[PDB]
Amino acid sequence: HMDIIFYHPTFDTQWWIEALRKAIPQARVRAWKSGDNDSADYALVWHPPVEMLAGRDLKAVFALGAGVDSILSKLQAHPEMLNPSVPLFRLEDTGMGEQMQEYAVSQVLHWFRRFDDYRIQQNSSHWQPLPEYHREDFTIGILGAGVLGSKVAQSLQTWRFPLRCWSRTRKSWPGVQSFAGREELSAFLSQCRVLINLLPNTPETVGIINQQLLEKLPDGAYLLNLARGVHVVEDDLLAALDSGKVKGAMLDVFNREPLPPESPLWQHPRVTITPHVAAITRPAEAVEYISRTIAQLEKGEKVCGQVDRARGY
Amino acid sequence: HMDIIFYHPTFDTQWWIEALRKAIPQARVRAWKSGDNDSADYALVWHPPVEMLAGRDLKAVFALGAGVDSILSKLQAHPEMLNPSVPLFRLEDTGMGEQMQEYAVSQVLHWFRRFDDYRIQQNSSHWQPLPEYHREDFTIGILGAGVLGSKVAQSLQTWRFPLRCWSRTRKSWPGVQSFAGREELSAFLSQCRVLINLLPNTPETVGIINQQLLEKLPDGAYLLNLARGVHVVEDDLLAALDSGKVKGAMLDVFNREPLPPESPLWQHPRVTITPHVAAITRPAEAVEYISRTIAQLEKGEKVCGQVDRARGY
Ligand SMILES: NC(=O)c1ccc[n+]([C@@H]2O[C@H](COP(=O)([O-])OP(=O)(O)OC[C@H]3O[C@@H](n4cnc5c(N)ncnc54)[C@H](OP(=O)(O)O)[C@@H]3O)[C@@H](O)[C@H]2O)c1
Ligand SMILES: NC(=O)c1ccc[n+]([C@@H]2O[C@H](COP(=O)([O-])OP(=O)(O)OC[C@H]3O[C@@H](n4cnc5c(N)ncnc54)[C@H](OP(=O)(O)O)[C@@H]3O)[C@@H](O)[C@H]2O)c1
Ligand SMILES: [K+]
Ligand SMILES: [K+]
Ligand code: NA
Ligand code: NA
């Protein structure tokens, strides 16, 4: 027997309640409204109001996404929102791994096969085979080597691209050179023909993709930002695009979302924009992960997917 | 000890001669010029002149490509060109399998993730997440289930797309529904959200992708022509593009190559054009396949990659 409160600003609240009741039949599930101060054991939230969590000794909070920077930043401004005793969980993969693989593999191959060059030539009705690129010149670097970074690396390794990753701690993936810490970031960047960003938004990573980082990439590099918009200094990226340093950039996330129409990114020739749809939360897989995690918590089984509030992700 | 004559209209003749001499050190290799009637054991050819092969009792001819429709059509017009005793071989895979996989996986995922829709929206600086497509609605059909068709099917199966193939004879690939013969072509087409053409050019397949075939596809279908241009009736494809039957078409081959500038395909919004570069012949891999095949022929080992002239491919 448990009480679950649910909040999401836009999802189909009623669908989630019913799906949760089926997956956890002993649970009483309700949508949280302002003024609801009744007891609750678990909270499933996205962009929760401070009032929903403040003062509650919850058994756990589940953030309905892979990123938790919005909740953590709100907790920094409102420390009363989440008691330190409450463990905070996020969605680990739950289908977002495959979605990132689809996105990254498609576009890496797109660039590797020079479909962007052939499109420019097609615009002028110009027929001209181009020299093929070689894998030895197409090392792919993944900023962030976590749940999603590892999935993307694995899918690209299938295609025999040289691979490297960057994180805080060393990784052991065969065939993927692991770089760790700011002290190794420059060496990491020196060979990244394609740079894929899958970092979390933390104070230590804000603005990391800036002029100083971009200039260390090889010439004709490609940028794939699948993480958070604050990671990229957009005016620095535009300068690197205009100078020829970056041959192409595909961006799914931006400092302001929706991306304002005045942004030069919309109409820049070498920029491809998707409206933050790289890896969406699939309700059925999220319900399965949450219900399974709750069962593991009840059985005392060690669990994965817990946020370290001191660490920031 | 053997004599090899080499002809290619555009490749680096001298590089090929030297590479062949290294791979087959007992071989005397020479570029064929008009008037060269000296003896030869093997001929490596692409678009060979009739004079090069006529009257020669060669041990084998190796066509320097996967398709042999140009040689077979020339032999039909000049039956004296190749004695019936001469076995004819083509390049089987030799790296073209992976190239077709790169091409097909990239573009299938491109369409599956609606990057074409997001690009149209980006042209207007319009931010709008779109509903995701589902694999159950994205059955991929492969016209031609051969060396390259099987490789493409295998790579797409990795991504959990429903798969079917069409050929003359039944296939046994687990998870891929095999359709065989014209009598099953209509049933094959009925579910193909994406149609990938990897057929050979033969009299039995010319013009197969026409109005009658396209109308049997599901609405919003996609066409990927990686095979030969004569397979597609281009005015029928344009009509299906203008009516909304076909959502997108990516074409690497055309009835006339280079594609004349007057073709409406160049500037049609839903058409993507590459200049016959889907899977190019890589000299080093071709030299390895040819030298290995010759050794197998000398040892009496059963060989693959032989053209059936009565069959047409
Ligand atoms: N639609 C979308 O665009 C979409 C969807 C889902 C997620 N995302 C984004 O993708 C991000 C990654 O998700 P995930 O599940 O892969 O997260 P994760 O498993 O926590 O992985 C985070 C990785 O970043 C590394 N990292 C963090 N801070 C660092 C620093 N200061 N220096 C170097 N490396 C650092 C971590 O290194 P260690 O391994 O050493 O800890 C870890 O490898 C999310 O935070 C979210 O913002 C975007
Ligand atoms: N850059 C490029 O665009 C590029 C590069 C390389 C090749 N290609 C093209 O790709 C083609 C395929 O090469 P491949 O090595 O895969 O050839 P393959 O191994 O001979 O495969 C041909 C397939 O087509 C099927 N087929 C032939 N005639 C048919 C008919 N009348 N009805 C139904 N099915 C039929 C065959 O069926 P069975 O299996 O029953 O015999 C076979 O499965 C080449 O011929 C070439 O034109 C293009
Ligand atoms: K901007
Ligand atoms: K045309
Ligand atoms: Na209710
Ligand atoms: Na010479």
Residues B144 and B221 in one domain: yes
Rounded to a whole number, what is the distance in Å from the CA of A94 to chain B's nearest CA? 16
Residues A59 and A81 in one domain: yes
**Token digits of residue A132:** 């093929």
Pairing of strands B88-89, A176-180: unpaired
What are φ and ψ of residue A157, in 5° steps? -60, -35
Q: Are A47 and A65 in contact (CB under 8 A)?
A: no
Instruction: Report the separation in Å between the CA atom of A177 and the middle of ligand 3, taken as the mean of its atom positions.
Output: 33
Residues B126 and B156 in one domain: yes
**Token digits of residue B112:** 């599956």
Q: Are A252 and A226 in contact (CB under 8 A)?
A: yes
- Resolution of this entry, Å: 2.1
Chain centre distance of CA B275: 13
Helix, coil or strand: residue A292: helix
Residues A269 and A299 in one domain: no
Rounded to an integer, what distance in angstroms lies between the CA atom of residue B129 and that of residue A277? Answer: 7
Ligand 1 nearest-atom number relative to CA A149: 16
**Experimental method reported for this structure:** X-ray
SS (H, E, C) A16-79: HHHHHHHHCCCEEEEECCCCCCCCCCEEEECCCCHHHHCCCCCCEEEECCCCCHHHHHHHHHCC
Rounded to a whole number, what is the distance in Å from the CA of A110 to chain B's nearest CA? 6
Rounded to an integer, what distance in angstroms lies between the CA atom of residue B8 and that of residue B129? Answer: 50
Rounded to an integer, what distance in angstroms lies between the CA atom of residue A296 and that of residue A303? Answer: 7
**Token digits of residue B35:** 């008037």
Identify the DSSP state of A231.
G
Number of domains in chain A: 2
Strand partners, B60: B42
**Token digits of residue A75:** 């907790």
Residue B106, CA distances (Å) to A298, B28, B147 in order = 44, 43, 19
Rounded to an integer, what distance in angstroms lies between the CA atom of residue B178 and that of residue B154? Answer: 14
Set B228, B268, B270, B309: catalytic member: B228
* DSSP track, chain B: -EEEEEE-SSS-HHHHHHHHHHHSTTEEEEE--TT--S--SEEEESS--HHHHTT---SEEEESSS--HHHHHHHHH-TTSS-TTS-EE----TTHHHHHHHHHHHHHHHHHTTHHHHHHHHHTT-----PPP-GGG--EEEE--SHHHHHHHHHHHTTT--EEEEESS----TTEEEEESGGGHHHHHTT-SEEEE-----TTTTT-BSHHHHTTSPTTEEEEE-S-GGGB-HHHHHHHHHHTSEEEEEES--SSSSPPTT-TTTT-TTEEE--S-SS---HHHHHHHHHHHHHHHHTT---S-B--TTTT-
b or e along B170-209 (b: 16 or more beta carbons within 10 Å of the residue's beta carbon)? ebebeebbbbbeeeebeebbebbbbbbbbbbbbeebeebb
Helix, coil or strand: residue A143: strand
In angstroms, how far apart are the furthest CA atoms of chain B? Answer: 69
Residue B309, CA distances (Å) to B54, B67, B82, B83, B190 in order = 16, 13, 11, 11, 32
A276 is catalytic: yes
Rounded to an integer, what distance in angstroms lies between the CA atom of residue B156 and that of residue A46? Answer: 35
Residues A272 and A299 in one domain: no
Residues of A in contact with B130 (CB under 8 A): 277
Q: Are A105 and A300 in contact (CB under 8 A)?
A: no
A71: CB partners within 8 A, 6+ apart: A45, A47, A48, A63, A82, A88
Residues A133 and A102 in one domain: yes
Residues B91 and B110 in one domain: no
SS (H, E, C) B66-79: CCCHHHHHHHHHCC
Amino acid (1-letter code) at residue A197: N
Strand partners, B44: B6, B62
Name the residue of B68, B99, B168, B285 to mutate for ligand 2: max ligand atoms within 8 A of Cβ: B168
Count how many Cα atoms sit within 13 Å of the Cα of residue A93 in the half-sphere of its side chain: 13
Which bin fits A108, alpha (ψ -120 to 50), beta or left (φ > 0)? alpha
Amino acid (1-letter code) at residue A180: A
Identity of the residue in B119, B122, B258 whose CB atom sits nearest the CB atom of A127: B258
Residues B152 and B178 in one domain: yes
Residues B273 and B286 in one domain: no
Structural domain that includes position B287:
1-96+280-313
Amino acid (1-letter code) at residue A274: T
Chain centre distance of CA A125: 38
**Helical ranges in A124-174 per DSSP H:** 147-157
Contacts by residues A113-120 (CB-CB < 8 Å, ≥ 24 positions apart):
A113/B102, A113/B103, A113/B106, A115/B106, A115/B272, A115/B274, A116/A247, A116/A248, A116/A270, A118/B272, A118/B273, A118/B274, A118/B275, A118/B277, A119/B272
Rounded to an integer, what distance in angstroms lies between the CA atom of residue B244 and that of residue B92? Answer: 37
**Token digits of residue B113:** 């993730």
Identify the DSSP state of A133.
P
Rounded to an integer, what distance in angstroms lies between the CA atom of residue A89 and that of residue A304? Answer: 9
Q: Are B196 and B152 in contact (CB under 8 A)?
A: yes
Who lines ligand 2 at CB under 6 A? Answer: B 66-67, 96, 144-149, 166-169, 198-202, 204-205, 226-228, 252-253, 276, 278-279, 313
Q: A125: closest CA among B257, B234, B263, B235?
A: B263
Set B21, B276, B282, B309: catalytic member: B276
A135 is catalytic: no
- Count other C-beta atoms under 10 Å from residue A166's C-beta: 27
Rounded to an integer, what distance in angstroms lies between the CA atom of residue A53 and that of residue A4? Answer: 12
Rounded to an integer, what distance in angstroms lies between the CA atom of residue A31 and that of residue A14? Answer: 8
Rounded to an integer, what distance in angstroms lies between the CA atom of residue B123 and that of residue B111? Answer: 17
Q: Are A107 and A152 in contact (CB under 8 A)?
A: no
Sequence length of chain A is 313
Residues A68 and A134 in one domain: no
Rounded to an integer, what distance in angstroms lies between the CA atom of residue A95 and that of residue A147? Answer: 11
Asked if B261's CB is within 8 angstroms of A122's CB, the reply is no
Q: Are B86 and B229 in contact (CB under 8 A)?
A: no
Helix, coil or strand: residue A303: coil
Rounded to an integer, what distance in angstroms lies between the CA atom of residue B135 and that of residue B151? Answer: 20
Residues B44 and B162 in one domain: no
Mutation target among A11, A130, A259, A277 for the B interface, most CBs of B within 10 A: A277
Look at ligand 1, atom 9, and give the residue with the nearest C-alpha. Answer: A227
Asked if A119's CB is within 8 angstroms of B277's CB, the reply is no
Look at ligand 1, atom 34, and give the residue with the nearest C-alpha. Answer: A167
Q: Is the dihedral of CA A294, A299, A304, A308 positive or negative?
A: positive
Q: A147: closest CA among A96, A220, A209?
A: A96
Identify the DSSP state of A4.
E
Rounded to an integer, what distance in angstroms lies between the CA atom of residue A219 and that of residue A191? Answer: 10
Residues A112 and A181 in one domain: yes
Residue B243, CA distances (Å) to A298, B115, B215, B238 in order = 57, 21, 11, 9
CATH number at residue A79: 3.40.50.720
A17: CB partners within 8 A, 6+ apart: A6, A29, A30, A31
